[PDB]
Symmetry: D2
Subunit: 333 residues, 4 copies
């Protein structure tokens, strides 16, 4: 029973609350902070447009919600300086507001009396970034305190990149992620700092930038400077694909590329990276707990140019990787 | 030329801008206020996910945008007290932020120099509310200075209700509007004061309240207390339909209900209310300039109970109604 | 264990299959007939854009599919005369192709050795039409052999109409169903006998006819001649609502209308009709097993005119109703 | 006025009809053949979920439609051998059913009195295949009678690939086209020879195959065997992007890739290929008349690996390409 807190009970925060419920034997969410009133908060817990109804009952009052007869403290402090985790013996705070991805801002959780902070996103000034199944062994139970669990796309790309580079070496690579729309995008054409994301999300293919390809280097140093890419946001509510095209010096074939993924995708790592030969479409990978679902039927090769494609549920898959990482932290003060 | 300012360059503000280019010979938009920087504003004006590309070159600088060679002063004041419409000799302000539907607040525009204010929405404390085609002949240029052009749904409902009440007598009625999603709804399940409008707009049927059927009484006072209804937000980006079930003492048939609309839907009034026997779906009424398109194929009659359905592009149709009102105001004394 | 065949392994057929696995102790689907090859048939069982992945393993060979170890025999006969259900000991056939809603055509399943046929749609020339929870107690094991489970919309409307008519009396009413798009509609503007259903389904509000308001008269003959209505197909893949506006002679309030549903919506009937005060949107009723989910928050009253709204998952809720009817047929005399 | 018949009055057929009215001074559609009855056909001409309402009045009866006072003969022959284009003095037939992309089937239109046939798709056994702006100068009026206008995707990729191959040299490249759903796909999970295209089109990203990149070789033989790729079908109703990642021996920068397109995208060729630095999304390119709209803002370079992205309205863009080709045919012998 390692006692967990959630800062920012949004898509990832609520996906995380459910993942813990359905997957963890040893964690407990005992406090959450969120800018929403508790009626809204509990409604959005009980009903979900993507995951469906929560298995259990939810009640609320002015400073709590109660899920399956278990009382949870709730705060509404839009600056985490004004919080007090310590008061609920809270060991870890998932930082999923998306506004405290700077560790200098996030560490504030520690100041409020937390031991760990896992930011549910690419970060800055953090102690360490991890994609579970890729670089989790270099967690430092003593020094690694404010950390990143990286991005959905990085948790898709890195597993697959690592294997294929470990095997054939990647010289250069460029990625397109065709990605479900997310909450930062606008429903109607409206204000946004990014002039494409300003555009009505559910009727547009929307190009946008992503650090996810560069960010791979945070977990695979050997690929620094070797990878870049961008995203096409498309009208599905969840479910995404990472399409990577790359150059190798090795002689390769489709078969050899596919057999390497297949070979590697077993055991504990297989809980992160899956190998498929199924006729998949995006709805088939909704609620899939892998970080990366390699699609063997999409593999292409001309000369020493290779295209490979991997799926991920950007909500649920990512969240399952964030739970793995959290179990690790939780197993070692 | 009558000079117009727009406060709130959003969906309705930008439809209104284009409507003026496309349909007015005597209005010109000379200043706009909005919270966006001018690079953002000009981009959203040039490119539109519903109306397509503006047919004119657009440039911007620190103080302005220029559209087909005409400079438009641009401000970014959250508080309208800080505007200066008089500097631009603006006659009429379209209030389309959604934040100043109280006339006690919208009157700031008048104090900042405007002569008239038309709120793009149900208002309070307003001098008068109008649905063009229904009650605009009661516009009073000396006493009606801050006015409402009502809601999209009311502009769809009121014309059809006037005809049917005038010819048959509506005793009682309940409406459902099946309505395109709008910008306040959430893309992903997230915080909202309305617990249903919180839910991912583009994958849900979302019920929501609307005063639109009660508000008909503002323009047809003979129907106070007689109409109510509600909305179902559905996944289309624009285009809507109003479904009205009502009772009459008159003896009626599908045919006589339909003839009653066809008879009335001519001349000037027919620019507000259309009569159709076409096999319409919502994309067919996208960029229709009527406030109300009556679908004769959907009329049903059971005893003394009648169901009628009228379409409306809640963006462009409503805007064209607002533009009709605007032209009326501009045609008369602005003193 | 009563053994079941499905003719038409489409949206309803495959929902019905999953409903049996998940909800039934005493039925088993052992044979299916469809137009698809076994690879295609198994792919579409295994993977589902709405229901997600089957939680059983699916394999195939060239005369069968295997699901959690159970061999299901597979046919691809366009003409049901050419089937043989008796070779599989099938007592009941679900007729879910959409092409054999005439009971004179569907009776070919009985010629081919079945005992009972349940058409998953409005039918013609049928022995009897049922909405489970409304008129199923009139099922006659000897003489009701080829029957209808009526439509999705009828299974939403009838339970609500029965309670309100029993309590207050319904003089007249007109219905609008706001309904998920269905396989009859076109993805792109293209040929259809219905010129509105011809139009790209996922970008349009599409008006179309519905027989649900006549059909309620079949299971509730007190409402003969009293109801009419239509449908608006909208861009959701499943999930629908029935909006009924009616006149009553009773003096009624929002509260008394709601209380009547809440009072009725209990026990076994409560598995057909639920009563809700939740802030529902369509996704919230996806995979709900009720035929009808009354939304108390949408009730309106103007004098003696009432507007009520009930939800339904037109795929899964209807299928659960159809399963309830199947369980009843299966619980009685299948013989003659 | 050169007189045009349309076989297959579908999405492409009706796009073409409207493209002639809006864009041609010298072509007239005088006859159409389709499976539909005239009520249905006239309705789908008048009303379009993508294009909006036709500007002109539309009437029909048992053997015709009338558009803007112009009478169009209508037929419903499943088999093109039973047609008589000669009886309407038709010179060119647009073959847009999707069923006669084999030239040996499409030549039935010539037996039936047409002089030229333009297949609105990749063909087999055709006299020649053209991407207007890339290879149309090789059109041979005497020998090229049953021709192909290639695919939407090839019309997007080939102009871009020609420019970039000319300037820098393409060793190999692999394409992903993120494409609008099309009529071949299913609305609900349902029968289909392609187990991905079986899946409900408007709620899925759907991978499927395409010969569009190999087919570039037909108009640019120098790229034979150098390109392949596939499609992801996504839930927009029209509007697509071609994403090409390729290898060059050249040392290249983002700026020099972009500059190469900009320099090329001028004059007549620039009606086929546009250069843009705008913050484009798919709805911006709906009803765009170009075959290819190069998005300069998405170009990336890593070492010797280059990624470029061009937009296309797979309906109207393609159709405008197909009309350009048609205009060329109309302007030479027969
Ligand atoms: N969705 C994805 O696919 C995905 C995948 C991987 C990672 N992520 C990352 O995870 C993070 C969360 O994203 P999301 O999609 O869950 O977004 P979201 O639904 O908008 O979640 C953020 C939640 O925190 C609340 N919040 C905002 N500011 C707060 C504050 N100062 N104090 C407390 N609560 C506050 C939010 O806003 P209100 O409650 O004020 O509206 C909301 O409930 C982001 O960094 C995102 O990039 C997202
Ligand atoms: N859309 C419809 O179907 C419809 C139909 C009929 C009537 N209406 C009514 O028309 C009004 C506008 O609706 P809409 O859909 O056009 O909404 P919208 O697109 O959100 O328009 C609002 C615009 O006003 C700006 N704004 C907000 N607060 C402001 C302030 N204090 N000062 C200046 N500009 C400000 C917004 O910028 P930021 O977003 O950057 O703040 C945005 O550009 C509402 O009253 C609505 O009910 C809408
Ligand atoms: N979807 C709903 O919400 C809903 C709700 C209630 C009731 N219903 C009713 O249920 C029935 C089926 O609807 P649905 O949505 O499931 O349609 P669907 O998905 O089209 O299913 C029909 C199935 O029957 C197959 N089929 C067609 N003709 C056949 C034949 N002669 N022999 C064997 N198989 C044949 C089809 O294969 P092919 O596609 O390859 O022809 C398909 O797999 C209809 O009567 C419909 O009204 C549907
Ligand atoms: N849509 C695109 O984005 C696109 C882009 C470039 C090229 N293309 C190509 O253009 C062609 C047509 O595609 P589309 O999207 O327009 O498909 P579509 O909308 O289905 O058009 C086909 C039309 O042909 C009719 N038809 C079918 N068989 C016929 C026959 N034997 N004789 C006469 N008419 C017949 C169909 O009527 P029924 O439906 O009643 O059978 C329909 O009206 C295909 O080769 C496609 O590959 C399409």
């Amino acid at each position: 029973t390692i006692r967990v807190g959630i800062n920012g009970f949004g898509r990832i925060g609520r996906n995380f609350f459910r993942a813990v419920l359905e997957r963890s034997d040893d964690l407990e969410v005992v406090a959450v902070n969120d800018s929403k009133d508790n009626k809204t908060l509990s409604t959005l817990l009980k009903f979900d447009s993507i995951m469906g109804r929560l298995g259990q009952e939810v009640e609320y009052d002015d400073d709590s919600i109660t899920v399956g007869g278990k009382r949870i403290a709730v705060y509404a402090e839009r600056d985490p300086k004004n919080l007090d985790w310590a008061a609920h013996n809270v060991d870890i705070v998932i930082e999923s507001t998306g506004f405290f991805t700077d560790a200098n801002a996030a560490k504030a959780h520690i100041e409020a009396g937390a031991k760990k902070v896992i930011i549910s996103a690419p970060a800055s000034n953090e102690d360490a970034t991890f994609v579970y199944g890729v670089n989790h062994e270099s967690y430092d139970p003593e020094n690694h305190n404010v950390i990143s669990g990286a991005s959905c796309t990085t948790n898709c790309l890195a597993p697959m990149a690592k294997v294929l580079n470990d095997k054939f070496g990647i010289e250069n690579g460029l990625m397109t992620t065709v990605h479900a729309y997310t909450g930062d995008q606008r429903l109607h054409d409206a204000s946004h700092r990014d002039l494409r994301r300003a555009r009505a999300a559910a009727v547009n293919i929307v190009p946008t930038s992503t650090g996810a390809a560069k960010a791979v280097a945070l977990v695979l140093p050997e690929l620094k400077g070797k990878l870049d890419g961008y995203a096409l946001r498309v009208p599905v509510i969840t479910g995404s694909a990472t399409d990577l095209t790359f150059n190798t010096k090795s002689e390769v074939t489709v078969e050899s590329i596919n057999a390497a993924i297949k070979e590697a995708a077993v055991g504990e790592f297989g809980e992160t990276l899956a190998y498929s030969e199924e006729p998949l479409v995006s709805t088939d990978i909704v609620h899939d707990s892998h970080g990366s679902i390699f699609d063997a039927g999409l593999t292409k090769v001309s000369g020493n140019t290779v295209k490979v494609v991997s799926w991920y549920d950007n909500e649920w898959g990512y969240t399952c990787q964030l739970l793995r990482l959290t179990e690790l932290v939780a197993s070692k003060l």
